[PDB]
Nucleic acid binder design. Structure first.
Lengths: 167, 148, 185
RNA sequence: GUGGCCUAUCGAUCCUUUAGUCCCUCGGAAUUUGAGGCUAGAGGUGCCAGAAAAGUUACCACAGGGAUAACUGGCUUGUG
RNA sequence: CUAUCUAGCGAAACCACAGCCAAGGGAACGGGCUUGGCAGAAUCAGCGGGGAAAGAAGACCCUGUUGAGCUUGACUCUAGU
RNA sequence: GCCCUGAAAAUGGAUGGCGCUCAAGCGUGUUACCUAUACUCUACCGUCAGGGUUGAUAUGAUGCCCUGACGAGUAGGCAGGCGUGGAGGUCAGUGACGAAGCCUAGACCGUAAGGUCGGGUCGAACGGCCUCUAGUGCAGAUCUUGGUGGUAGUAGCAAAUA
RNA sequence: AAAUAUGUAAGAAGUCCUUGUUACUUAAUUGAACGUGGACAUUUGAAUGAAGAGCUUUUAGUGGGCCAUUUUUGGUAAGC
RNA sequence: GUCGAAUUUGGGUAUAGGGGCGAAAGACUAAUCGAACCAUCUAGUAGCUGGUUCCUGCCGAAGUUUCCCUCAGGAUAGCAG
RNA sequence: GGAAUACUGCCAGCUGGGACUGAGGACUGCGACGUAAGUCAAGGAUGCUGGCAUAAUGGUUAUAUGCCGCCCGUCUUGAAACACGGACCAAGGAGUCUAACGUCUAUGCGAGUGUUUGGGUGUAAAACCCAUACGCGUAAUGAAAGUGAACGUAGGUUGGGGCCUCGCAAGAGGUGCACAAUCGACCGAUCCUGAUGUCUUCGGAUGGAUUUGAGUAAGAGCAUAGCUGUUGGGACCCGAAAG
RNA sequence: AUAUUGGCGAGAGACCGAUAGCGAACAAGUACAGUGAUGGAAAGAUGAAAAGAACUUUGAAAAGAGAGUGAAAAAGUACGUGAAAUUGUUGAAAGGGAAGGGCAUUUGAUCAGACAUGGUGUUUUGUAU
């Protein structure tokens, strides 16, 4: 023949791993983040936009809305390390946010056969946004210039030093 | 063989294990036992003392057959008897039947007293012996008779 | 770095794994290393380290030495052991009934012993008769009797037998061996 | 007290020669000469752990040397 | 008459790789290294500073327990007479 | 004490250069800071030592596994290995449906020596493993034999009237 | 008359008590040496460390050396 | 320079290697001469020069003692494996 | 008079941010919190989510960039050298073989060992069988003639692995091979003493000696193979002038 | 009985395999050098079989392009394969008194691998795929 043989063919029955000891403890959010807070987004489709914070979800994410009537931002879920917690504070009390959870945002993943040649919304999500934004704008109208403060965007100018800025 | 020689391992190493400085040359100290009274004097004086000189008396036409006098200590003396009859002659340690031993037929010329054969009688035929060996035999009750 | 006091990666200087290819010897090793590992007896370790030895260090043993050993007191019914071979010796005529165990037996030695009612035995039977070394008695034979040793350490004023082939007058009985020819030693 | 008050003042093999024991051998067996051997010194190698030994080569040669000269260069600076 | 240009023919020595300098240090005089200066394809004719240019295992000197030639009241011998 | 005079050499010229003057100089001090194949920690390789493990059913006890320390290197020594020509054995081995060889900025393994694969060319035998054996591995030797170059389309091919 | 370097000892093969041999020694069982028997054990006789200690065989290469700190010789001095 | 002679020269012939021949230089002796050329002994000897063919791993030096017609080298002890 | 503060030092005080790594692979153990169940940051990382699923990461290769980088081999205290060799390619090419040996190692046999000069026999240079010698070894020492290894449990002392006894163990004691040191005994040589005796000049008992040996003291060798090394041989390869 | 690198004749090989092995695998002691003694080489292979290229055309001719034999002219008497130095053409890339190399990465070119798996499952055709 060509190549003779091995003396000992190693096994194939895989050994199971060891009983690990890394449980899961909930996220300890920083202090600057409290519901009713205004945030800035630093990345995403909606970068530079100011937004509201409502809820801390279970998968270490945050519930968020423009609202949509203002800036075109809907209900959404984002990550805390990709935003800023401003000092600006508004009330959110009287909002029935308890419906929402991770299953509410289900992508229903796409198969491989479905490749787009070149190139929709759920009315439930639409009307839910329509339900919440009205309760929020009623509070936004209280303090001045805030509707505009949200409609606008955030950006830096020559001389803006973030390590010396305060948000 | 060759494939286990270290010449196969010295390939690539330049000097083949003989030095860059000393340079394996042919015959740098001499050929043979040259320098015995000279530069190899210490080796001779240390490891081969007596190499230089003559000592004694010369023996023209020495035949190494007058001096054929091989020995046989009394320690053995029964190897010459086959074990077939050895135990018989031993346990019948008696007079009037003593076993005879022709050493000469075995290739032994002299008899010597290394030590301590048993107390049985024996009869020995031999060319030469020594005083102590004969004493031990006749103390065991045997005898020696000489031959040529 | 390090300030090395001793040499690094220095072998023990000792021998393991008898580098013969005698499969039966390797079996005996596979057995006695187990016994040493697990029996906490020193006899097994001794035997093991002895099985590894060369031929000059596995010297022969004579039944005469054995009988000397058995003429000790409280040692007659003991069991002898030799990690080596066992020779015969016409220089004696009596021999007791004692059992013996060793690697190799010459025909003469085996005949002598069995004729005396004893038995010549292998170490694999020894192990099952006496694993820890019950009632045993080890013997190892002389090494400095070899004819090479005579030449070991040859200098002046030693008594140490030059390396030579031909012995007689006019072969190193001259200058350096007697006063009248120069000097002595 | 085993040479000089102490520290230096001297010498191998081989060969020769002398003293001793009157001992061993001369190998077919003996005697007597003679020779050879054993032990201890002397005859000396000063290149002194010890070859037996005259020059020249500007007609020259070979192996090699920068381990080593004649130029430079370099450190040095006596002398200048 | 050559050299020069052209047609035709067409070698060799030499060649570690190659080809700008200063100073420094360094096997004490570098083309390469270090710091500086500088540096723009491909080349022609000349030149004779340099490449410690080439040429030849220095022919002077030394060593060699290598020789040879020549001499002589060296040592040892010898043909002849 | 600093500075100056003393204080003069040969290619152009060197606190390393630029350049610096309450310094980027001299003296001294307080902190922060940069970074070495050194130290610490972790992983991986190897070696060495000390150890554990024959129990049936499974392979390999010179095996598997655990612990700790260490690793520079000329001359030189020892060991484990790769490769080449050939022998004894075996693979009831490959093979004209294409062996070996050769080319291959195509791929894979190995610390490496080297090994294997694919494509191309070609056309007749060759290899893997266990052992044996030796005319056994090249960058050199002013090496040997052969061949080929840069120099270089250069020197030059010019005496004897045309 | 220093400093630095240097030798030895710091126990079990020891200490102590007793009494046995001898052709040595002594005026002498007086000693000397080697011994029998008996007591003295983890503080067994200073500290630290020990990476295992001890031993043997055999063989290679080497036997051109050089620099520096300090001591120092010759030399004017020298990368002598 | 010499050019009618110690002239120049052809052919034939003699002389052969420690030998020849030499108006003498150690010149010539088939491009070879302070001892030709060819082959053999001969792969002469060489303490001297040059070279000495694959990997990895592990250990790791000496240039110092004493003797030598020894000083460019050996034996010896040491260092190392 | 009463305090604070700095400076130095401590906490088995708290707390935030950042970087690198995630080795291992059923449990086993140390531990915390717990009434317990059990859980735990406790003997090495798991969980959640997304994109792509292809030259995108990756590899190779060429180039560019930043930093470093002197041309190899050699003798040498010291070479990049203004020290030698080297223009380039291929192929060839240099510690071998043998006689006799040492140490060490494997193997057979073992006070013996070695078949192979030779014979027999044969499937024919093979393999198989074998006698007698011989070699080496078992006895050394002396120039040689020649002599020739136990007073003793083949000694005593010290120390010794190991074993046996007692002992839970600790340890104590008995035996104590090899080996080392040492005092003795024995063989031979040398120097003495010189019994019975006697061819009256032969013999050499006995006892000794700061003497001495390559010795005995319950044998260890013989043969084959192997590396390494030694000597001789062309002797690692090439190399002279010379005779 | 013993010797035997010569001669004649046979047989074998852990030998060499065309820079090796005798100096010579071929018209080798040949050519060739030298006055001479003497010295002394290099050089093997088409293909199974010459079937070794009819014939056309360009060219003065050699030769070339076609054609054709042939399993194959990538076998054409400069012939087995047909390496390297070295060279030419094409293609790619770079290029200020060198080039080359190492660490890292960009850019360009180029390249391997895993992508199924078992599986609830029959939404099934060839009815069990």
């Amino acid at each position: 023949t060509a190549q003779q043989a091995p003396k000992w063919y190693p096994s194939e029955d895989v050994a199971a791993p060891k009983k690990t000891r890394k449980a899961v403890r909930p996220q300890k959010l920083r202090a600057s983040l409290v519901p009713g807070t205004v945030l800035i987004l630093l990345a995403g489709r909606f970068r530079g936009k100011r937004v509201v914070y409502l809820k801390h979800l279970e998968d270490n994410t945050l519930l968020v809305t423009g609202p949509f009537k203002v800036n075109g931002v809907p209900l959404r879920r984002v990550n805390a390390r990709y935003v800023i917690a401003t000092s600006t504070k508004v009330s959110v009390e009287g909002v029935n946010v308890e419906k929402f959870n991770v299953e509410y945002f289900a992508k229903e993943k796409l198969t491989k056969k479905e490749k787009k040649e070149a190139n929709e919304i759920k009315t439930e999500r639409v009307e839910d946004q329509k339900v919440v934004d009205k309760a929020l704008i009623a509070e936004i109208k209280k303090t001045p210039l805030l509707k505009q403060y949200l409609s606008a965007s955030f950006s830096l100018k020559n001389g803006d030093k973030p390590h010396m800025l305060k948000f | 063989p060759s494939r286990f020689t270290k010449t196969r391992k010295h390939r690539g190493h330049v000097s083949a294990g003989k030095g860059r400085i000393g340079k394996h040359r042919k015959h740098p100290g001499g050929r043979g036992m040259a320098g015995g009274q000279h530069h190899h004097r210490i080796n001779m004086d240390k490891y081969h003392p007596g190499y230089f000189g003559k000592v004694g008396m010369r023996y023209f036409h020495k035949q190494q057959a007058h001096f054929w006098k091989p020995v046989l200590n009394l320690d053995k003396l029964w190897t010459l008897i086959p074990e077939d009859k050895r135990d018989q002659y031993l346990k019948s340690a008696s007079k009037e039947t003593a076993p005879v031993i022709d050493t000469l037929a075995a290739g032994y010329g002299k008899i010597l007293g290394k030590g301590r054969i048993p107390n049985v009688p024996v009869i020995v035929k031999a060319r030469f012996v020594s005083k102590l060996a004969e004493e031990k035999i006749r103390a065991a009750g045997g005898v020696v008779e000489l031959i040529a | 770095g390090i300030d090395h006091t001793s040499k690094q990666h220095k072998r023990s200087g000792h021998r393991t794994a008898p580098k013969s290819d005698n499969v039966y010897l390797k079996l005996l090793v596979k057995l006695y290393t187990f016994l040493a590992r697990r029996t906490d007896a020193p006899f097994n370790k001794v035997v093991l380290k002895a099985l590894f030895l060369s031929k000059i260090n596995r010297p022969p043993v004579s039944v005469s030495r054995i009988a000397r050993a058995l003429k000790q007191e409280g040692a007659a019914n003991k069991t002898v052991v030799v990690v080596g071979t066992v020779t015969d010796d016409a220089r004696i005529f009596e021999f007791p009934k004692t059992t013996v165990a060793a690697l190799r037996f010459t025909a003469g030695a085996r005949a002598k012993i069995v004729k005396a009612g004893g038995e010549c035995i292998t170490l694999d039977q020894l192990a099952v008769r006496a694993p820890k070394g019950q009632n045993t008695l080890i013997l190892r034979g002389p090494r400095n009797s070899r004819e090479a040793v005579r030449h070991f350490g040859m200098g002046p004023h030693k008594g140490k037998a030059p390396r030579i082939l031909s012995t007689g007058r006019k072969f190193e009985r001259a200058r350096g061996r007697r006063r009248s020819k120069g000097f002595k030693v």
